[PDB]
RNA sequence: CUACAGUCGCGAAACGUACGUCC
RNA sequence: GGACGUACGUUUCGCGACUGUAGA
């Protein structure tokens, strides 16, 4: 509740009116130095001039938190502070709430929207703008964007009241560079985009700094792989067999993808599957119907050997069991939706192997050695000291739920609960509260930020599995890295603010120009109607001539035959995007097709099917080439903007 | 070597060591592991930082001494073979032992934690009284004290097994004269 | 001569049994010495009626005159017939009667490639012993590689005769291109398969008898930062803004035109990003035949210049201003010089605005490259103790070599410094003592490495590392058995003769047609591709009158020679203001003829109208019509 | 502390020493970096590896001590203020000193290059006698060896300057007291 | 002059996968 | 649905500089 020195050293440069990325590691500290500046800016107010400073926030928790936060303490001072969510998006006239208020939390992708609305044409309507985790002001960014408006509109030549621009992050980020000359050019690159004339950083607080910044140590973990192995022998066998039977239809898909001589359990092997994929999409026999037949058949065959490799790769990192529940699943998946003689005949082939399967996966001289080492290091914590709540990350959300099953039926480490959050003695995030001393990352190569309140820090363990030396190699280097952003950042202390402002303005002129320079408008749109297909059913559903487009980001169907093209199912987990409410998603309706088209908006009071282009291959109707494109922007067609008068 | 010798030097088994340990032919002279060698799958293999003898006991007779320098914690204890696999010693009913805890502490583990100060022996020679239960530790030149006594009314052999901290390579333990 | 050591015989015995090696001897003559061990021990045990034949590769022609020198002085006791082939022999007393009529030839490769090529010697079985020097360099096309797949589908398949010993002599084995140990001990498979060879025996006993001879001198790094007051490339930077503005509007297309996203004044990305502008606006296709040739002038005057401007930035980022002041100076007076115009003379008065303050600031002890000072620190430091060391210090380009003899020629405080560049000092030389400064380059001797760019430093810690895993890779493949091992690399052989024996089929469509080439600045319509000829499948001239008054040439004041012709002078533009390098004017054996060569050229096709743009007429198809003397 | 003891321990001039020694914060211990720091440049800096002190002599007594310990290769002398200074020590007429030479000797250089024996001291002592015009070198427990004698009757100031190799870091010399 | 050759340095496009985040 | 950011890995493509070779 009090100010220290920790926390009033920051704002003092911050008080002359000037524009900083000062980077406290605290949460509370943080937003102790955002509520300083912002209550020194409101008492500094002259009659004629009141507050109308616009605070940035990037995920919901953050924004939700600054929201209670300001609306608790400035309530009592004579301001009225309110906030943009996603809800707020609706139903009501937004330059209203710009005005009528003083302390706007809004989320920086609603003022891009309202840039492109027409709603605050100039940015002199508010008079103050502070970032929080602007280290994300990096490229393209919606951060970028307002500081390309900013800059655009403070450099351009049309200087008016600009105002003023004051940053606040965590921790600087090296981003993508390898050298500590790059680590400068990032850091004083981050400056230049932001208006920084200084960075503000704790110096004379280090006693303060050390008590709370929870700082731990490497625990890195080193462990030899597995020799005997029956599932990969039982699935390479099927997987034999599978491509085997495969390729009597289609003899030329080694000659039709590029890839070399693949291996069975490798991420290269779905590199190699899902171009061969790609590879046969494109077949285009002239019988339109042989080729839907033929094109649904090895679709079902790559789609199978797909799935084998991904419990090959589940065996590879994971226990035995959870590839095994994870192929069952997905016959069971497959048992749900159709049946062909092609899924007939794999089906009984699954069943046959299936109980060689559950044989052999029950063995428990098959565990897996990295899982047993990983448990023998958990047993040697739990006789350091019992009292540990452990926490782990891994690479995937995969192993996440792998890892809890590993917990759930553990009679060697029955101390373990499970907490799924992505009370709890255990708890597995993938990504990134530090009360719990024990993170455990295993097969995983900023770093994890664990610090949000005035705690302690009292020790910890943060325990790494390596399998292969990629992980050493690149963390050691990782490790070398962090000590060279600390050099890069006393690098940049030994500056005056003169050669620092004359370097920012080479950089932003430098920036400016090259922006100014990059403004390409959209080409020559396609009015030519292509049509399109289904990629696993080579079906003819639609064309360029019933597709509209609602926000140029959306691509509709008018066609309403297509409405009964498809089949509507209702979504598992239904909500808004600024525009809509999500009520299902849509499966194309053929004999057993059941692919997935898109998704089902509710936007006023239509049933809109909202498609998207990763489930179409893009057909020529003058030639009838059968082209890809993969992302809708890359389409370039006669876009018709969205018509809601018609229906 | 001055007060009443019973035992005889203990050896450790086979085939209930840890997957971890390379001990040598001389037998009575372990070192730990760089990496653990992967051994066969059985169920006698002790999967701890754990190893066992095989010197079924005596009558009453009994005393043996034992290197326990040059290693950071260990553990040193008596164990009955039909011991559960996956239990440490310290976790059950069928153990006496000797703890040098982490936070700089000779605590034991026993039916309980009976802490001591921070005293840190080189040295230990347990001495083994099966008559009345009579079981003590004349560690190191702290005029023979033992400084603790158990009682075990048990009705299997009670062999020594060794636990350390395995995750230090380059340890190593040794049994040496009584 | 020198004497044999115990190490030097204990390389040299797995060769002597009797299978292939691959030496691995470090520097210091002693490879030298044991090629001449083994060829001593093996062309000493033959038994009569046969005798042997040694083949001694060497890469370089002054190691080749050397090893040719050495086998010479070494064997005339024994009665050997030493020879030699090189480049430089005449056309007499051909090889087979050379191959026939001696005991130890030292070819340069590419003589024996020509020679199985040819089909002129049958195949190497006339051969028992080719000895490789710097076997590390078999890789992808390198000749020693394609006298390998000679020797290796001789081999596999078609089994003749008896085949050659393999013997490398490598000085280290060179893991490049790998980053965990299992790649670097797959690239030390690959090379060891690809010779043919089996037993990779280094020194391992008497290491402490070897260190006498080879040194590993310690390192020091010396990283230092850029400059602050960086005034020059301020005001390059001014003149590279107006330059490229008014080709902007001269333009105004011209972001389309390549991929580069950001592209900043003076790096290496601008100069490639100025180069693909350059080649974009050379393809032009309007119909206003005069407007195009002021577009085109244009565009290649302020792509030109701003190229100029880029590497004096270049040059001014790795040395003292004055260099790259220098370096400008002389190029504006060679294009002053050289024409008349109102964008030369709109160019020349910009620069010429800007030269005097420019100069102002380059003649300053303040605006100093403190990299050059760090320098002058070690140079002066280290001479200080040991007054007669000599230093070998690398630089990048060649220009940088000027620049540094320059300045050390013009230092007050480096008075005692003799330099010499490639009795004297220092030697600043770039890729060829006490003293072995790198800048920035990638007894109780040290090595220096000065940069401003990190990752110079970690490239060369990337590199002792490499050298460990190369060390640890070849201790781990010395324990293998030979017999797998043999299986192991005729799998590898095998796999490799399946890959190069099935795609060679790069088959040429002559593209029939007639063509007309043009000037590569001012397009003026030169010549027709029906009139060129093919003169002995190298030069490439225009048997036409109409052509003549299009070019005029510039007296070259002395003549020259080539093999077979004899070079009179350079040919130029005959344009107002284009004065391009076309080529040179030549005598073929009776009269004279113009010589051109497609690199300053487009080729405009007569019916499409489009223009591309060539470089090697190996890559350009036409009818290749070989000249006829008669016209 | 056994001779006449006559004068002062002196402070190095942190206007004059180059960018590469970092004398500390007690300000009277010379030591190199390991890389440079780059300060204001002045006309008044070395661009070699020297420092200078600041305080100017007297008439007849001067004398210091300084620990030629922790230093591969070292050189004290004294200088006057009028130095060239991109010169290195003792290869002017403004110089006396001793210089510990790559093929280590106690050379010193009145420029004129005088080879000594192989003797190493760890502690060097300057005794000035300015009434006489005498310099000399008596290093530490020498029964006051002189090591040389050089006379220069100047009307300048002659502070106590120092050269030391400046490649090595974690080279430093120390002054201490007599 | 043709013409291969090996190394270095900086790049740009077409990708698959993994995580998160918002609108 | 689409936008953005980060990481892993693969397959090519041109560019500039350095070094050397054979034919003519
Ligand atoms: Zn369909
Ligand atoms: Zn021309």
Redesign the pocket.
């Known amino acids: 509740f009090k100010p220290r020195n920790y926390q009033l050293e920051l704002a003092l440069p911050a008080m002359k009116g000037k524009n900083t990325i000062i980077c406290a590691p605290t949460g509370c500290g943080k937003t102790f130095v955002s509520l300083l500046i912002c209550e020194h800016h409101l008492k500094k107010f002259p009659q004629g001039q009141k507050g109308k400073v616009v605070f940035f926030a990037?995920?919901?928790?953050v924004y939700e938190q600054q929201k209670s936060v300001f609306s608790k303490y400035f309530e009592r001072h004579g301001y009225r502070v309110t906030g943009i969510?996603?809800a707020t998006?609706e139903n009501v006239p937004v330059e209203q709430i710009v005005e009528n208020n003083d302390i706007i939390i809004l989320?920086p992708?609603?003022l891009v929207?309202n840039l492109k609305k027409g709603t605050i044409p100039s940015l002199s309507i508010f008079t103050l703008m502070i970032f929080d985790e602007c280290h994300?002001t990096?490229?393209?960014?919606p951060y970028n964007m307002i500081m390309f408006n900013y800059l655009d509109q403070k450099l351009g030549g049309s200087s008016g009241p600009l105002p003023q621009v004051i940053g606040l992050t965590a921790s600087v980020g090296v981003?993508?560079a390898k050298n500590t000359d790059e680590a400068l050019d990032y850091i004083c690159k981050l400056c230049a985009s932001l208006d920084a004339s200084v960075i503000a950083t704790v110096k004379h607080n280090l006693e303060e700094l050390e008590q709370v910044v929870y700082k731990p140590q490497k625990f890195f973990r080193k462990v030899e792989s597995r020799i005997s192995d029956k599932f990969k022998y039982i699935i390479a066998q099927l997987m034999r067999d599978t491509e085997s039977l495969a390729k009597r239809i289609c003899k030329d898909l080694e000659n039709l993808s590029?890839?070399?001589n693949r291996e069975f359990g490798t991420?290269?092997y779905?590199?190699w599957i899902?171009?061969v994929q790609?590879a046969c999409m494109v077949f285009q026999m002239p019988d339109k119907d042989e080729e839907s037949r033929i094109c649904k058949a090895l679709f079902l065959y790559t789609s199978h050997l797909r799935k084998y490799n991904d419990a090959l790769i589940i065996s590879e990192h994971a226990r035995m069991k959870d590839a095994l529940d994870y192929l069952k699943d997905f016959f069971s998946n497959v048992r749900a939706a159709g049946f062909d003689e092609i899924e007939q005949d794999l089906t009984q082939r699954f069943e046959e192997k299936l109980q060689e399967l559950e044989s052999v996966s029950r063995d428990p001289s098959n565990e897996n050695p990295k899982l047993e080492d990983l448990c023998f290091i958990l047993q040697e914590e739990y006789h350091l000291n019992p009292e540990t709540i452990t926490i782990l990350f891994v690479?995937?959300?995969?192993l996440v739920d792998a890892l809890k099953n590993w917990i759930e039926g553990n009679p060697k480490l029955s101390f373990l609960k499970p907490g799924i959050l992505?009370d709890h003695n255990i708890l597995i995030?993938?990504?990134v509260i530090a009360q719990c001393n024990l993170v455990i990352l295993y097969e995983y190569?900023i770093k994890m930020i664990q610090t949000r309140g005035r705690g302690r820090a009292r020790g910890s363990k943060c325990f790494l599995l390596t399998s292969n030396a990629?992980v050493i190699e690149?963390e050691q280097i990782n490790m070398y890295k962090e000590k060279m952003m600390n050099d890069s950042i006393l690098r940049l202390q030994t500056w005056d603010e003169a050669v620092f402002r004359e370097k920012i303005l080479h950089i932003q002129t430098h920036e400016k120009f090259i922006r100014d320079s990059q403004e390409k408008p959209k080409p020559v749109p396609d009015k030519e109607n292509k049509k399109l297909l289904c990629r696993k059913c080579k079906a003819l559903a639609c064309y360029t001539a019933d597709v509209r487009v609602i926000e140029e980001?959306?691509?509709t169907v008018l066609g309403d035959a297509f409405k009964e093209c498809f089949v509507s199912r209702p979504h598992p987990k239904p909500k808004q995007?600024?525009s809509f409410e999500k009520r299902a998603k849509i499966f194309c309706a053929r004999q057993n097709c059941s692919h997935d088209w898109?998704?089902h908006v509710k936007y006023k009071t239509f049933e809109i099917p909202?498609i998207?282009?990763?489930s179409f291959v893009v057909e020529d109707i003058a030639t009838g080439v059968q082209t890809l494109y993969?992302?809708?922007?890359?389409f370039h067609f006669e876009k018709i903007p969205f018509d809601p008068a018609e229906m | 070597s001055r007060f009443a010798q019973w035992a005889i030097h203990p050896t450790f088994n086979l085939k209930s060591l840890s997957c971890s340990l390379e001990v040598s032919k001389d037998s009575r002279t372990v070192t730990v592991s760089h990496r653990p060698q992967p051994y066969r799958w059985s169920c006698e293999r002790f999967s701890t930082s754990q190893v066992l003898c095989s010197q079924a006991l005596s009558s009453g007779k009994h005393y043996w001494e034992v290197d326990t320098r040059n290693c950071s914690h260990w553990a040193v204890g008596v164990a009955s073979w039909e011991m559960s696999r996956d239990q440490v010693l310290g976790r059950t009913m069928d153990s006496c032992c000797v703890e040098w805890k982490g936070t700089s502490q000779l605590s034991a583990w026993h039916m309980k934690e009976t802490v001591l100060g921070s005293d840190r022996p080189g040295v230990v020679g347990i001495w083994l009284n099966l008559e009345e239960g009579k079981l003590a530790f004349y560690s190191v030149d702290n005029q023979e004290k033992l400084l603790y006594e158990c009682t075990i009314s048990a009705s299997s052999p009670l062999y020594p097994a060794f636990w350390l901290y395995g995750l230090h390579p380059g340890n190593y333990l040794i049994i040496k004269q009584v």
């Open positions: 990037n995920q919901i928790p969510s996603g998006a989320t992708q609603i929207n994300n990096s490229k393209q960014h981003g993508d590029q890839i070399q991420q290269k779905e590199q899902v171009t790609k690479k995937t959300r995969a992505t995030a993938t990504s190569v990629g690149k980001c959306h691509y995007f600024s898109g998704i909202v998207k282009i990763e993969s992302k809708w922007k890359d």
